[PDB]
Every structure is written in C-alpha cells, then in structure tokens.
Symmetry: C3
Subunit: 242 residues, 3 copies
C-alpha cells in the first residue's frame, strides 16, 4: 500500500513511494512495496518505461538513524536495493521531487534518467556520520555527476539543494518540485515512442560498462564500510545527528 504501481498509457508506468511515517525511508513496507512493484514490472512484457517517485517533500530518506544504531549493535543487515533498479529490463526515470539521502540518493542515481527538484536537499550521508559509503556510491556518483562533485559530496556527507547542484553543472534536469513528475512523465512518453525490444536492447548495451564493474565495486565498498562503520566513536556520532 505504501508503494503503488499505476499505468500512465503507452507502456509508461509510475511507481510511487508513500510511507509518511518513515518519510520514504527504507522501512520494511517500503522495501516490500518496491520489490513487489518491480517484480510486477518484470512479469509484464507490455511496459516500456518506469517513473519512480516519492511523496510530498520526500523522494527517499534511505536508512533511518534508528536503523544505523541497530546496525552498530549488529541487529540488522546491510540493505542492498541496487538490484531492483539495476535488474529492471526497461528504462527507469527517477523523478526526485523531494529530498534524497544516502541510499535514497543512490536509489535514484542507479536509474537511467534522473530529475532533481530545485528546492529539495540531496546528500550521500555516510561521511556525515563518520563512515564510508555502501552500494557502489563511488562508481555511480563519479559516473553520473563527475568525479569532482562526487568526491566532495562523498568526503563531506553534506546536504545540497537541487539549485546548488545545477549551479555546479550537473548533467541532470533540476526543475521546481511541482514540475518534477510532469517533466519525467513527458520524457517518459518521448522514450516510449520506441519499440520495447529496442529500449530493452539499448538499456542493456548502455549499462554494460557499469554492470561489469558493479559486483566488484559493491563488494569493495562493503569491505571498507564494515571497517569504518564499526569503529568505537561511530555510535556517538550517529547520536549527535538526531
């Protein structure tokens, strides 16, 4: 119920994340709804484009600070949602009409096209808490945003408004929040003019370089994360971010 799939016509579908209690964080119901909605897409051979979007002021909050505290005590797994986006056969547009944090930003950046909101806040959060990324952050961020913006965003963990990112020349559209989904929907109908077979073939071809590097990047980042996350001072740093 927190993640709904709706048909927009011409094989364009929308996956909408709405879990207001967690602010579209990676809650159990969000992860279940995403896996369900994307498996529905996988069974359907008529769909051509997916637009992934959130609700209100939120695209995706990623892992909560509560989750991170549970993790310092080894009570919870590392979540890897990359497969859902990466193994989807058809192009995905991430319409990030609201804020995206940590794994929430990665969730959008794994997509084939990304639309930012001008007013919203975007962050690879990890180093805000003093530890290194997971989810092949380095690979995807350097590929999509360029190495210098990626490097600064990764080292600092700091928050960037959509408009600040445009001003530093990211290749993605950065429009007003009320325009984000509409824009994605227009781009979606544009792409969906093509035969589905060509869209599937093209996506596989264009993704091959990143796809080939991904398993190793994921494993390497995790090795480093497990070391840096599990240092004594980390729990207290997380606490100071509440």
């Amino acid at each position: 119920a927190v993640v709904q799939l709706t048909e927009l016509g011409n094989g364009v579908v929308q996956i909408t994340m709405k879990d207001e209690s967690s602010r579209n964080g990676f809650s159990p119901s969000i992860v279940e709804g995403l896996r369900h909605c994307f498996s529905v897409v996988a069974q359907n051979q008529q769909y051509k484009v997916v637009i992934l979007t959130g609700y209100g002021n939120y695209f995706s909050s990623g892992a909560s600070k509560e989750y991170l505290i549970r993790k310092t005590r080894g009570e919870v797994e590392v979540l890897d949602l990359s497969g859902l986006i990466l193994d989807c056969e058809i192009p995905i547009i991430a319409a990030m009409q609201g804020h995206s944090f940590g794994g929430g930003l990665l969730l959008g950046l794994y997509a084939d096209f990304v639309v930012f909101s001008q007013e919203s806040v975007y962050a690879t959060n990890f180093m805000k808490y003093g530890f290194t990324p997971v989810g092949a952050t380095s690979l995807i961020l350097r590929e999509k945003l360029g190495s210098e913006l990626a490097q600064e965003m990764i080292y600092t963990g700091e928050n960037y408004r959509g408009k600040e990112l445009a001003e530093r020349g990211i290749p993605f559209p950065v429009v007003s929040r009320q325009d984000v989904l509409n824009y994605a929907q227009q781009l979606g109908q544009k792409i969906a003019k093509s035969p589905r077979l060509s869209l599937v073939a093209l996506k596989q071809h264009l993704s091959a370089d990143i796809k080939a590097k991904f398993p190793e990047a994921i494993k390497k980042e995790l090795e480093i994360h497990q070391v840096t996350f599990n240092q004594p001072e980390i729990a207290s740093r997380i606490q100071q971010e509440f």
Copy 2:
C-alpha cells in the same frame, strides 16, 4: 569532385565535402571522395592538421532514408567510415558548419577536435526510426559529450540545435555558421606550430584508450543493431520519416 583537398599553409589542409544532390549524405561519390582525400593525406608526410568540413547548410547527412529502405531488404552493406578518421595519423578538426545526422554526426565526433554551428541541427538519428546505433556511437558520444547528454541523444534520436547543446554544456566550441571554418582554421594553425612527429606521437597516445575499446564496441553495437533494425515495424517507421 564532390570531395576536394586544399592546402592552407603550414601543413594545414582542408577536406571539403560538397555533394549537393544528397546533402552531403553517405552517397557513393562522398564515400569515394573521402577515401581518396584521406589516402592522399596518408601518403603525404608534410601535412600536420586536417580540417574536415561540408558545404552550405550541411556537414554530413549520413545514410539517406532511401538507403535505409534498401537495407531493410538486404540490398546494401552497413557503411563503416570510422577507419578514415580513426586511422588518420594527424589531428583532424571537424568544422561542422552545418547539420550532422546519424553517421554524419559520428563522422565529426571521431575527430580529435570538433566545432559546432549554433544554428545547425545535430542528431544521433537511429532511434528516431526505432532502432539502435552503429559505429560505436555509445563509446564515442559518452567519451566526447558525457554520458547523460549522450544517453538522451541516443535514446530519443531527436534533433538538437548547436545552441541547445552549448546551453547544456558540451565541451566543444559552438559558434555562428559563418565563423565555424575560420575558427577551425585558426585552431589548425595553432596546433601546426608543433613538430609533425610530436603531433603524430601525441595523437596516438591520447587516442589509445578509445582505440583499444573500439573494435569490440563496433562489433557489439552491430550485433544489437542487426537485431533491432530487422524487426517487422521498422520499414514503416522509416517511411513515416520521409
């Protein structure tokens, strides 16, 4: 006669494409003239820079729609003009004073330096007709234009004015059509100040990464093109583009 080589001084030469009947498309006379002019360059050890340019409102139209229709019926080969640019020992400047479409855009983007016209139209056409690129489009476009502009241009097949491309921050000069060739000629004399041996050595060095990936990229794209081009609905899509 449709492709002429002229000496500009200081080892800078110009290859001018003028086939008005086909609009500088890949006509038999254009392909013959290009192969001839570039083999002339290959024999000459005095030349330092080539400026490749078209006529009037056209740099290069690539394969005609008529050619594509002949191709749906297996009457014509896939044209691969990459060798002519890629195997040239000396730097080439593509002065694209007019429109460049499909293989015509690639023809310019294979060059070491590229100059765009503000008013002209630029497209990787393939997906306009519903099928995937040939000629290592993905490789070259992502390398020269960045992955996000490349991806959008490849998925859509749509037409972009020089000025629209500058506004989205491509690293190439985008000047008025009447300025394109002059600009290329000035850059050409600048480069030609260097010893020819250093120019040849530097070009080989800077090209090595792309050169190493190229045969595989070419083969892979062709494999996919042969599948997507030869689907039943394609002939009719081409027909609707006349």
Copy 3:
C-alpha cells in the same frame, strides 16, 4: 627552509613552497623541502588534511628552461614528483594561489582537491616547446578536467588564466588569489571533521582506479617524451621561450 610545514589545528596542516629565486620551480631546495615535509606527514599519525600552497604570484613553476637545456645535453634526470602527492595517505588540497606550469600544474592536479586563482596563469607547457608531456599528464588531466579541455591544453601548451578555465566549466573552485588559501583552509577543516581512519580508507578507495593505471601511464608517456624531446629542433625551440 624554502618548504615549511605548519599546523593549523584539528589535524589540518599546511605545506608552503617559497623559493623566490626559482619562482617555486623544481629547484634542488624545492624538491628537498617537498620530500622532507611529506615524509614528516608520513610519520605523523595525527594529521588529517594537507594544504599544499606556494608564495606570492606562484604555486609552482615546474622545471626551468635552464633545466630543460641541461636535459637536451643529458646532464639531468627526468624529475618525477608524483609519488610525494600520490603516496600521501591523507587528503591533500592544492591551494594554487598563483601560476602553475608543466610539472607544476601536475603537482597540484595529483591532489585530491584543487583550488585555482582567477587571475593566475595555468599551463601544461610541454608542447609549447614542441615535445610531449611527462608525469601521466594525459591520465590526470583527462580525469580531472575532462578530455576536451585536457586535449586542447596538452596539444597547445598554451597559458590559461584561472577565469578562462572557469568560463569553460572546470569542476574546481576558481576564486580570487587572496581567497585561495582561506577557501582551502575552510574546506580542510570541513574534511577534518571525519575520523582519520575513514579519511585514509576513503582516499585509498577513491584513488584506486587512477592508482591502478598510473605506473603504466607514467612509463608510456616517458617512452614518448624521450622520443619527442630528443629531436634536433627542440633545443632551439626552448631557447626561443626565454
């Protein structure tokens, strides 16, 4: 004495190059001071960030023309200062408050973060004299500046003001000379908020791709440099640059 290390607080240190006789060129005292100051950093496990900076109107002049003349006669080694920057365990910010030429520009571009001065002049000098780069120039410049700016800067050897580079959209900050060091110092304190272990781990991770390509790039460029540098006309070209 020409290179001094000073502590700025919170594990941020500054390495200041001041050899006014050579204009911060790669003089014996500059190379000795750099090696000393960086080995001091290597022994200290408390430091988190280094800011590398020059004096007055100069960051680094690289190899003098006098040195190059000695080199045409085989009297001097090729200098490779890359190790000092590349083997430093902690992030380095190159605050290039003044001009940087040839190996002097590379010295800064090897760093994890780079700040340019608006008014200063920046050049990969090699081809100004008619010969090819050393120090993995192609690798680092294409990675940090993008292939098209890198290519033009490498082919021409020409001089670019900080402000000209910003106008062509380099991802680095380009601020007034009086602001360069302050800016670097602020960025330095920002980064130094993180645990040193995470900073060391992250730097290694983010550097791995370039680090893996570097020995081969260095060797390949040197092979080509040794050919192009040692051609008969080169000594006279250097002479005309005095």
